[PDB]
């Protein structure tokens, strides 16, 4: 899998489990189009999305349903969701890991791009 | 100024100056309508393009043009922009400060909401 | 105020109020000597206990009592405190703002240095 | 291994490789005492420190030589190092992962505690 998403909960000090993640690729009309989606596992990971075949260069959007996650915990959140928009540039045979750290009123996201 | 945006550069330890910010409000037809925009000052702050009257409840999107900022500094960043989407004032009027901390392959964003 | 400390609560989306902060300066004998201390205000800021004359170059340590803060809110946090250690003014006098963003199992800290 | 340290570089979008990490445990005299140390691997991880035998409850300090890491890259950093001080509380048979995200003028750290 060329694109991995890892979500952490900065409140409980745990993986963020059962979080819905939708991945989209930018299409000609500059409209978003579904690409991949799933729920994070107990390790907080959303795994084997697409293969290296369909993971072409382009603009991708990763949308993390943070709001539903916090509501499930009884915690009042600020964000409607977390969005990560980036360019996949084809250079070395690279894996992208999108990491997200969640708190009710803040999140951070980091890309780890490895050979 | 019920909506303030503050942007910091985590690489230089400075305010992120001259960063473009666009604010959208979700309209009735579920599309995004332009609400306010500006560039951060020398103190990394974007102030009042918005009044308290005009800043009614709704879903807002703050999009920070992080890519142009890194590129103008000779850096090729991961993300296209930083997006912050939230519901505003739905329990009455609040002041919101959206803080963003920028690195080339990482950003974080935090909301400070005061009465 | 050449040394300012600002602390935010990522759980409540608010300034972190009444947070204890201790600043130490490394002395000649390689131990830490007490330099300044205070509690954050309602705006989450700790201001001037320091003058520009007294804030000479050296290695400084800013220790933020995050544990007492979470516990006073009914929360059992991971960390004992947040520590920030840095060399100050070694190319002439600067203004430093140390920003800390707090969650129970996570914190981040950022330095903004201006001339 | 009951305690893992994972370090990321928010500048290059990579694991932070070859970073020196020193772990200390709080001793009776309220002095720090060496516990474990090593260099992060190419995956940015410092692995199999101690066993569950010697990883008892107590106050631990993880010190990450961020300054040497940035100097090796030609990047001028703010921090002397990053320090993470926490309490290991013995409850479920738990693994602690200490994650650190580094930028020249900022870092964040998160604990992921898992069964």
Residues 6 or more apart from D110 whose CB is under 8 A from it? A8, A10, A13, A101, C105, C106, D98, D99
| Residue B27 to residue D91: CA distance in whole angstroms | 50
Where do we find the tokens 């489990």? A17
Inspect the interface and report whether the beta carbons of A111 and D13 lie closer than 8 Å: yes
Cα radius of gyration rounded to whole Å, chain B: 14
**D43 contact C CB<8A:** no
| Residue D2 to residue C98: CA distance in whole angstroms | 32
Number of CB pairs, chain A paired with chain D, less than 8 A apart? 31
For chain B, domains (ranges, CATH) are: 1-115 (2.60.40.180)
Resolution (A): 2.0
| Residue D8 to residue D99: CA distance in whole angstroms | 8
**D59 contact A CB<8A:** no
Q: Is C33 marked within a binding site?
A: no
Q: C6-19: buried (b, 16+ CB within 10 Å) or exposed (e) per residue?
A: bbbbbbbbbbbbeb
| Residue D88 to residue A63: CA distance in whole angstroms | 34
| Residue A19 to residue A39: CA distance in whole angstroms | 5
Q: Which of C110, C111, C115 is the mutation pick for testing B, counting most B CBs within 10 A? A: C110
Q: Is D45 marked within a binding site?
A: yes
**B10 contact D CB<8A:** yes
| Residue D78 to residue D91: CA distance in whole angstroms | 37
Instruction: For C66, list phi and psi in degrees, rounded to 5.
Output: -70, -40
Taken in order A106, B64, C6, B115, is the CA torsion positive or negative?
A: negative
Method for this entry: X-ray
| Residue D94 to residue D3: CA distance in whole angstroms | 9
- Number of H helices and number of E strands within chain D? 1, 9
Find chain B residues with C-beta within 8 A of A110's C-beta: 105-106
| Residue B49 to residue B3: CA distance in whole angstroms | 9
| Residue A29 to residue A34: CA distance in whole angstroms | 14
| Residue A82 to residue B38: CA distance in whole angstroms | 23
> What is the side-by-side strand order in the sheet with D20-27?
C32-39, C20-26, C58-64, C79-88, D79-88, D58-64, D20-27, D31-39
| Residue C99 to residue C112: CA distance in whole angstroms | 8
According to DSSP, the β-strands at B3-9 and B45-46 are: antiparallel
Q: A64-81: buried (b, 16+ CB within 10 Å) or exposed (e) per residue?
A: bbbbebbeeeeeebbbbb
CA angle A108–A110–A114, rounded 5-degree value = 165
Where do we find the tokens 């694109």? A3
Q: Which chain D residue has its CA at the smallest distance from B106's CA?
A: D10
A67 membership: H or E segment, kind and range: helix A66-72
| Residue A111 to residue A89: CA distance in whole angstroms | 13
| Residue A80 to residue A96: CA distance in whole angstroms | 24
Contact C60, C24 (CB under 8 A): yes
CA distances from D22 to D25, D39, D94 (A): 10, 9, 21
């Amino acid at each position: 899998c060329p694109l991995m998403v890892k979500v952490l909960d900065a409140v409980r000090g745990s993986p963020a489990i059962n979080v819905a993640v939708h991945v989209f690729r930018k299409a000609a009309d500059d409209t978003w189009e579904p690409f991949a989606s799933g729920k994070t596992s107990e390790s907080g990971e959303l795994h084997g999305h697409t293969t290296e075949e369909e993971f072409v260069e382009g603009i991708y959007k990763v949308e993390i349903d943070t709001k539903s996650y916090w509501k499930a915990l009884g915690i009042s959140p600020f964000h409607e969701h977390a969005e990560v928009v980036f360019t996949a540039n084809d250079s070395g045979p690279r894996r992208y890991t999108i990491a997200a750290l969640l708190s009710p009123y803040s999140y951070s996201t980091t890309a780890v791009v490895t050979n």
